[PDB]
Write a protein that binds this ligand. Structure first.
Ligand SMILES: O=c1ccn([C@@H]2O[C@H](CO)[C@@H](O)[C@H]2O)c(=O)[nH]1
Ligand SMILES: C[As](C)(=O)[O-]
Ligand code: NI
Ligand code: NI
Length: 331
């Protein structure tokens, strides 16, 4: 109302104290074209906004196995006071690191840690984006058979799968969805052999929800499409980032096309940047669970090469998810 007892602080004497933010990466690595890459692009963009550079305010520690998680988190505790665990698999290692370093702030992406004041948890309604990918897939299949390549069987990938199946069923319940899991988010060779088998069995669209394993699914679709006419091409649905640029190829009949139908978006980078800004301002949301869904555009579908009929069905499906008229299952 009033502030009679006040003192003027000159701008020459004022500063904002900065934070140092690091990501600890899951198996996919910062070149997975999807989940970990999104996180890394977000941290780089945060670093740029704060006039920082790699290993001078921000960096990444790549994990190659589960045993690496703890070592990477402990290494990050040396110079960083905001540390991101990028992947549900990092749950336990983040819990342990947050308990040993109560003075530092920790974020878990894709799962929830309870009753830890220095931990924030971020989840995405990947069922809702998956549903839209399913509607898109059902509106473009000619063979009436589509493929789903998961990374690791889990609550997280089951949301994608359950949403995708439900979305396909909402358009045409007669469509067959072949489901196979690679058992890794960093095994490209397994992605290629699963995609090869799913296409050979009559899938004309594969949705790859497997991080870096998905590079094999792109490689398989490129090989098939290179040795075929453009009108006989087979589709891939992108994940986490808009992957349209990865679907470019030249057909057998010399035509240049794109085999990316649509991409589910998961704004991991945007979350990294937004929470890093909250941490620097001393407003770190410790103990909170942050839920991103279709409503807040934390997940979305990039429509890319979908037919106008498909786009209308997507917009109708999206509107019904926001309305509450359609409840997308999580299992
Ligand atoms: O290293 C990785 C890569 C991907 N994912 C999961 O796989 C999904 C699809 O890439 C991502 O949204 C994320 O939930 C992981 O858990 N770890
Ligand atoms: C009326 As319907 C469930 O086929 O979109
Ligand atoms: Ni006032
Ligand atoms: Ni005074």
């Amino acid at each position: 109302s009033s502030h009679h007892h006040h003192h003027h602080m000159s701008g020459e004497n004022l500063y904002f104290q900065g934070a140092s933010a690091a990501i600890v990466t899951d198996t996919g690595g910062v070149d997975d074209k999807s989940f970990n890459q999104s996180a890394w692009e977000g941290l780089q963009a945060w670093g740029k906004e704060h006039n920082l550079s790699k290993d001078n305010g921000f960096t990444y520690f790549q994990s190659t196995s589960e045993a690496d998680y703890a070592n990477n988190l402990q290494q990050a505790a040396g110079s960083y006071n905001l540390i991101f665990g990028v992947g549900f698999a990092l749950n336990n290692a983040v819990k342990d690191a947050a308990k040993e370093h109560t003075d530092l702030n920790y974020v878990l992406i894709d799962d929830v840690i309870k009753d830890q004041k220095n931990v924030a948890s971020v989840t995405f309604a990947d069922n809702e984006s998956g549903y839209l990918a399913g509607v898109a897939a059902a509106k473009t299949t000619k063979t009436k058979q589509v493929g789903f390549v998961g990374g690791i069987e889990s609550e997280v990938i089951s949301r994608f799968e359950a949403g995708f199946k439900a979305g396909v069923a909402s358009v045409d319940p007669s469509i067959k969805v072949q489901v196979d899991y690679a058992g890794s988010f960093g095994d490209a060779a397994k992605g290629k052999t699963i995609a090869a088998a799913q296409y050979a069995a009559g899938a004309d669209i594969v949705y790859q929800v497997a991080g870096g394993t998905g590079a094999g699914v792109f490689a398989e679709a490129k090989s098939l499409n290179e040795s075929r006419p453009e009108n006989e091409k087979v589709w891939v649905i992108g994940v986490d980032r808009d992957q349209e640029a990865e679907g470019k190829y030249t057909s057998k009949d010399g035509k240049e096309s794109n085999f990316v139908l649509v991409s589910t978006l998961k704004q991991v980078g945007t979350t990294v940047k937004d929470i890093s800004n909250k941490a620097e301002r001393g407003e770190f949301p410790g103990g909170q669970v942050i839920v991103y869904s279709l409503k807040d555009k934390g997940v979305d579908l990039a429509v890319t090469n979908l037919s106008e009929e498909g786009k209308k069905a997507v917009e109708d499906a999206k509107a019904k998810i926001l309305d509450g008229s359609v409840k997308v299952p999580e299992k």
